Structures are given as structure tokens and as C-alpha cells.
């Protein structure tokens, strides 16, 4: 004979009060199973008595990490103090129904007047809490703010991540998406620089013949203004652009003096210098990505970084998909991702598999094993020269 | 939906009161046909599948206005035989199936508590309050309503029961803690005006347990002081205020709230020659606070808010008033 029952869910814990309790001899009967199916014949059994939601996801996380371990929380003790009639079991008891046996023992030890029935032992309270878990969306919907699906989703993620310690040694997404960004904007830098090179050599065609390194081309067409306004070493720029006094600026200016290209307008020069500012901003962002990605690679997988070099190492990581996939692959699959060249390739694949599994399966990895394997590859590079 | 067969019982229950009203000369027969049609439409709306707490409240308001109308008409036609007990019983029935259908609506719970308190039902009010607190334990308004009505009745042990379970539950916001300190010091003022309690150590204990709560900010302790600073006419009020100030000074040393309680400490029970003396003391504290190393914009906003509170009172001198304006304007 049950009086009340606890029921804990991801939004909070609610205790129901049973009226017209379930038949215990005909629990395996088809009419009683159909009654437990239909909400119109199970809501006559249960009536919602109290509800306690969590204050925050931190409290829900503490709630699971206490309840699954077995120990009851202080706010569950609080809500039971509030909802149950205060007795001690000398002349009248209260039967509570709980899902877990350790929680049953602890609630009975905290409240001596409450006899708890566990769902793991008693079939009546098992079927009754099973029906409440069946109809739990509709029994709470008058005070169910939102849904239960996203709450269970986020709470299962928080519980699993707290059990696993996931975020402290999962770090590879920054590396693989940084490789994707680096290649995409390297292509975009080269394409925008080719576009500004053609569309400014239409105006001044000596700059393509006399100046390479298209980033420095974008800088000199940012600083040069028009064809008419040239002077060599005016202020702050060309001395640290390139050689200053006797080598380059004179040649650019005599190229402007003998220059024959089409005269450009002010608004067209404005648009070309806007495109050059765009290209050099993307180049500055490329060097910021390269520095930050070298630092992140030395934080995540330093052995692969020292045996391969960080661009090709992080390319290999991104093509494998993750460090866990890279470590699970053997050395021949890492070959997939004359004779001396293939021999050094197989040896490098073996040592790169060893470096990948060492750098992955550490908590916070090291440097010296990659240093040892790079010394081993260097002494093999010395070894193949004797023959 | 068996709603016709379900509402048949409530109409057949309300019928003999209409028979008594027809056999008296109070409602005529066309008016009683109108009452029958309106109660029938209300019952078939109430017992419908898709219903609402505003629908239950519209039916409650109609039945209660019908009771008031019949009371006016009965006093006008000079009858004393007709009683309001059947109308109160059916209004309690409407409210009970209302809180059965929608237990998660505090507007309907508070309307139920207002009705049960208004027609003199104290024991029923306590039972409804217990059910509402069990369903909404995180509601500081319900907890303060329970505790304040038990203190207004005078059962201070029951008021403490409701308040300590409320402070056991509602620990995210300071609101119920401030209201409990307010109720305990109001009990202290009642114990003083009736002339342990001689020490008055319970708000100091409330502060000492509130020191470790998840709302424990300097703004929350300033809210504690702004609660405590009212009704200073007591015995251990200087003890409580001084303990709050030394707690805030030992914990949050250079906060603008702590400098504000350093400003506004010595004006506890003042209204009168002791008023401008303590005002000059507090203005010395305020000038030291303004020159001292604290976030001056935050402290100045606190002081211009308190100075609006100062300017809200009459009966002062114009030189003091204009120097408050002069010290206000450059903030």
C-alpha cells in the first residue's frame, strides 16, 4: 500500500500522491496493463502533489552526480521535509515509493517514519513509476516550462562530460578548422593579389615587371597613390619595405618617369586601394593564424609537430578527421593518408603513428619523445648517406 | 468528452437554491431562466477539454457577484431566511476543480487564497496554502504570504515554520530572506511594544547564515541593511546595524555599498536637535567617502538616489537643502 511516490526527472523532482492504488495480484493482467497504458485510466491513480525544479544546470549536474552515486541531496531532503507529514514510526508510518534501493535506505534513515519501497524490489511501485515515466510529459504540462527533450539532452551531455573530463583533453577542432581557414584564405589572398596585380598593371605596367611578392605589391599600391605623385624616401615606409637608398626606389621612380600606361581616375584608384587594403588585411590575418596555430599545435600534439612540422602535421590531422582517428589508424593507413624513398616513407609513417598515439593519449603531453624520434630520423638521414 | 453528463450534476445541485429563490419573491422567473442559462454556459465551458484559468476565474467572479447581488436584494426585500452557504460551497467546488485542472497557475492559487481569506475561512486557508506551497516551493511571494499571515494571526511558531522552510528552498534570490528578517524584527517590535528577545540575536543569526548563500553579494548585504534601517525605535538595533557594518567592512572593504553603509549608518532612529547633528556626522562620512578611493560614479549614483529619498521630506532648512543641491549637481 503506497501513499506517496518520488519521481526524479531532468527538469526536477516531483512527488505524486496515489489515490485508488493499483491492484497487486492482477498486475500481469491485460485489463490492468491497458489501464496502465491509457492516460485517462492512470491519471485517476496518480495526482500531482509537489514539484521542485532545479535552479540551474549546475544544480541539476550535482543532482545526478549525487543520485546516481546513491546519496540523496539536501534539497531533496528539504522537499521531503516540506511535503511528507512529520512522523516517527512508532504508531503510524508513511509509505513512499522510490526508484532506487540505496535512495530508499537513505530516505528511511533520514526520516524514520517513512517506509520506502524500491522499484527494484517491489512490482507494484515498479509498475506505478513505470506508468508515470510513460505519461510524464502530460502529468507535468501545466507547470512544465518548455519541454523535457532539450533538458534531458543538455543534462545528459553535462553529466557525461563531467564523468569523462572531456573538454580538458579534447582540443583538435581548432586545429582542423584552422587548417581549413588557412588554406581557404591563402587561396583567396593569392586570387585577390592576382586581381589587383592585373587591374593595377593596366594603369602602371612597370610594377609587375619590377616588383614581385604580391603582398609587397599590395603594400606599394596602397602607399604609392597615383602615378604622378612619386618621391623616393618620404616618410616611414620604404626603408623597412625593402632596400631604401640605392637599390629599389630609384628604379620604381625611373619606371614612373618612363611609364606609358593609362591614366587612372580618382574613384578607380580608390577602389584599387580598397582592394589592396583588403588583401593586406587578409595577409596579416594569415600570419596571426600561423602563429596561433603553431602555439596550439605545440599545446596539443608536440611530437607530430617536431617530427613533421606544424603545417603538414596539422594537414594530416585534418585529413584523418581527429587525433583519435589518427591514432586508431595503423602505419600503412598513415601511408595512405626508387626504393630508398619508399623505405624512408615507411619508416616515417611508423614513427608518425608512434608520435600520434603518444601525443594523443597523454593528458597534457610532452616534448622529449618527439625530440628522440626526430633525432632518430636525423641519424637515419645520416645512415642512408653511407652507401 | 462526457461534458453534458458531467455538468448535469452541478446544475442539478444548483437547482434547489433556485427553487427557494423562486418561491421567495427575490428573483423573478425570467431572471431565474437567465441564471440557469448563464450557469449552464459556464459549466459547459468549465468542464470542457481545452480550458483556461481565466475561464475558471470568470466563473468564480460570476458566482461571487451573484452572491453579492442576492445579498443586496435580500437586504432590500427584508428577508433573513436565505443564507449564502450554498453559494460559498459551490464556489469552493469551482476552485477545487480549478486547482485540480491547472495546479501550475499562481494567479489562480492566489485568487483561491484571496477568496478563502475573504469569506473568513482560516483553517481552509491554511490547507490551501499548504497545497500551494507544495506545488510552488520556489515562490517567494507564496512563502511570504504564508509567513506574514501566520504572523498577523500571531502564531509566530507557525510563521517561523513557513519562513524557515521557505529559506531552505528559495536560496537563489535574497527576497524571502529579507522578508524573514523583516518579520522577525517586526516580532521584536511587537515584543517591545507589549511592554532570547532581550538580546534579539535572531537577525544576526540570519545574517551569519546568509553570509554563505548563493546570492551573497555586497548589493544583497546592502539590501539587508536597507531592510534593517527601518523601524529603528528598538533596543538592540544599534547592535544589529553595527554588526552589519563590521561584517561588510571586514568582507567587502572598498565597495561602494560598504561606503554607503558607512555614510548612512548614524541616522538610525532620528526624525529635533539630534537630526542635524547626526546629519553633519553623516555628511562628514559622505565627504570622506567622496574623496576616498572608491568607484565614484557608483557611489554618486547611490548618493543621488538616497538624496532623492532625502528630498522627499519637508520640514528642513533652506541652507541645508541648497547645499544638498550643490553637492548633488557636480556628481
Amino acid at each position: 500500500v503506497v501513499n506517496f511516490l518520488l519521481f526524479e526527472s531532468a527538469v526536477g523532482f516531483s512527488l505524486f500522491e496515489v489515490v485508488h492504488q493499483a491492484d497487486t495480484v492482477g498486475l500481469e493482467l491485460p485489463e490492468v496493463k491497458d489501464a496502465m497504458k491509457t492516460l485517462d485510466k492512470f491519471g485517476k491513480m496518480v495526482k500531482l502533489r509537489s514539484f521542485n525544479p532545479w535552479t540551474s544546470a549546475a544544480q541539476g549536474l550535482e543532482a545526478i552526480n549525487l543520485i546516481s552515486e546513491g546519496i540523496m541531496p539536501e534539497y531533496l531532503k528539504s522537499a521531503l521535509e516540506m511535503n511528507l507529514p512529520q512522523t516517527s514510526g512508532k504508531k503510524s508510518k508513511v509509505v513512499l515509493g522510490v526508484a532506487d534501493k540505496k535512495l530508499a535506505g537513505e530516505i528511511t534513515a533520514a526520516f524514520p517514519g517513512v517506509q520506502c519501497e524500491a522499484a527494484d524490489t517491489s512490482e507494484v511501485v515498479a509498475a506505478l513509476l513505470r506508468g508515470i515515466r510513460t505519461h510524464a510529459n502530460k502529468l507535468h504540462k501545466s507547470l512544465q516550462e518548455g519541454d523535457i527533450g532539450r533538458a534531458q539532452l543538455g543534462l545528459g551531455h553535462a553529466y557525461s562530460r563531467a564523468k569523462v573530463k572531456f573538454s580538458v583533453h579534447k582540443n583538435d577542432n581548432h586545429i582542423i578548422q584552422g587548417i581549413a581557414t588557412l588554406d581557404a584564405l591563402d587561396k583567396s589572398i593569392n586570387q585577390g593579389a592576382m586581381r589587383v596585380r592585373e587591374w593595377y598593371g593596366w594603369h602602371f605596367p612597370e610594377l609587375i615587371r619590377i616588383v614581385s611578392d604580391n603582398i609587397t605589391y599590395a603594400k606599394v599600391v596602397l602607399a604609392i597613390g597615383n602615378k604622378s605623385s612619386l618621391t623616393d624616401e618620404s616618410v616611414d615606409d620604404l626603408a623597412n619595405v625593402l632596400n631604401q637608398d640605392q637599390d629599389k626606389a630609384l628604379a620604381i621612380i625611373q619606371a614612373a618617369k618612363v611609364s606609358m600606361g593609362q591614366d587612372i581616375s580618382e574613384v578607380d584608384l580608390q577602389m584599387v586601394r580598397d582592394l589592396a587594403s583588403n588583401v593586406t588585411s587578409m595577409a596579416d590575418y594569415r600570419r596571426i593564424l600561423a602563429e596561433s596555430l603553431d602555439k596550439k599545435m605545440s599545446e596539443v600534439a608536440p611530437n607530430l609537430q617536431v617530427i613533421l612540422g606544424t603545417p603538414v602535421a596539422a594537414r594530416l590531422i585534418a585529413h584523418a578527421g581527429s587525433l583519435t582517428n589518427l591514432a586508431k589508424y595503423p602505419a600503412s593507413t598513415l601511408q595512405i593518408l626508387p626504393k630508398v624513398k619508399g623505405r624512408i616513407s615507411r619508416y616515417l609513417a611508423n614513427k608518425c603513428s608512434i608520435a600520434s598515439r603518444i601525443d594523443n593519449f597523454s593528458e597534457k603531453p610532452t616534448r622529449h619523445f618527439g625530440e628522440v624520434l626526430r633525432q632518430q630520423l636525423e641519424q637515419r638521414l645520416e645512415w642512408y648517406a653511407k652507401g | 468528452a462526457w461534458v453534458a453528463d458531467k455538468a448535469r450534476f452541478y446544475l442539478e445541485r444548483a437547482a434547489p437554491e433556485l427553487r427557494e429563490w423562486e418561491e421567495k419573491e427575490i428573483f423573478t422567473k425570467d431572471e431565474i431562466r437567465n441564471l440557469v442559462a448563464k450557469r449552464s454556459d459556464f459549466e459547459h465551458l468549465v468542464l470542457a477539454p481545452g480550458t483556461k484559468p481565466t475561464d475558471f476565474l470568470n466563473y468564480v467572479n460570476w458566482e461571487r457577484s451573484l452572491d453579492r447581488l442576492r445579498a443586496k436584494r435580500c437586504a432590500r426585500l427584508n428577508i433573513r431566511s436565505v443564507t449564502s452557504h450554498a453559494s460559498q460551497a459551490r464556489t469552493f467546488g469551482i476552485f477545487e476543480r480549478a486547482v485540480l485542472k491547472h495546479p501550475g497557475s499562481i494567479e489562480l492559487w492566489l485568487a483561491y487564497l484571496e477568496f478563502a481569506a475573504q469569506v473568513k475561512a482560516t483553517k481552509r486557508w491554511r490547507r490551501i496554502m499548504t497545497r500551494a506551497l507544495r506545488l510552488h516551493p520556489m515562490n517567494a511571494s507564496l512563502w511570504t504570504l504564508a509567513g506574514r499571515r501566520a504572523a498577523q494571526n500571531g502564531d509566530m511558531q507557525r510563521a517561523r515554520a513557513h519562513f524557515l522552510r521557505g529559506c531552505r528552498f528559495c536560496t537563489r534570490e535574497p527576497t524571502l530572506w529579507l522578508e524573514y528578517a523583516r518579520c522577525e524584527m517586526d516580532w521584536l517590535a511587537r515584543m517591545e511594544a507589549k511592554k532570547p528577545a532581550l538580546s534579539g540575536a535572531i537577525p544576526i543569526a540570519v545574517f551569519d547564515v546568509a553570509r554563505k548563500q548563493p546570492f551573497w553579494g555586497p548589493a544583497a548585504a546592502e539590501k539587508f541593511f536597507d531592510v534593517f534601517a527601518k523601524f529603528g525605535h528598538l533596543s538592540c538595533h544599534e547592535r544589529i546595524i553595527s554588526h552589519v557594518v563590521t561584517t561588510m567592512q571586514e568582507l567587502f572593504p572598498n565597495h561602494p555599498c560598504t561606503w554607503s553603509v558607512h555614510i548612512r549608518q548614524p541616522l538610525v532612529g532620528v526624525d529635533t536637535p539630534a537630526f542635524p547633528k547626526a546629519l553633519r556626522e553623516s555628511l562628514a562620512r559622505l565627504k570622506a567617502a567622496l574623496q576616498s578611493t572608491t568607484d565614484r560614479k557608483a557611489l554618486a549614483t547611490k548618493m543621488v538616489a538616497w538624496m532623492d529619498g532625502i528630498l522627499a521630506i519637508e520640514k528642513l532648512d533652506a541652507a541645508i537643502r541648497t547645499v544638498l543641491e550643490h553637492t548633488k549637481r557636480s556628481l
Binding site: - | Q157, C167, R168, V209
Partner: peptide, 28 residues
């Protein structure tokens, strides 16, 4: 009877608040 919320005692006192308040009222 679970009709109302009974006054707390030392048996049904949970937190440090209720322990300290009951200690003060016991010393009263």
C-alpha cells in the same frame, strides 16, 4: 495528517539556519 506545515523541531531541522534558530529559541 499532512494537512498543514507543522513547526520544526530538532528532529526535522535540516540546515545550519534551522539549527541555529532552534538553538537560540531553546536558549530563550
Amino acid at each position: 495528517d499532512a494537512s498543514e506545515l507543522q513547526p520544526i523541531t530538532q528532529k526535522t531541522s535540516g540546515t545550519e539556519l534551522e539549527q541555529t534558530i532552534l538553538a537560540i529559541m531553546e536558549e530563550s
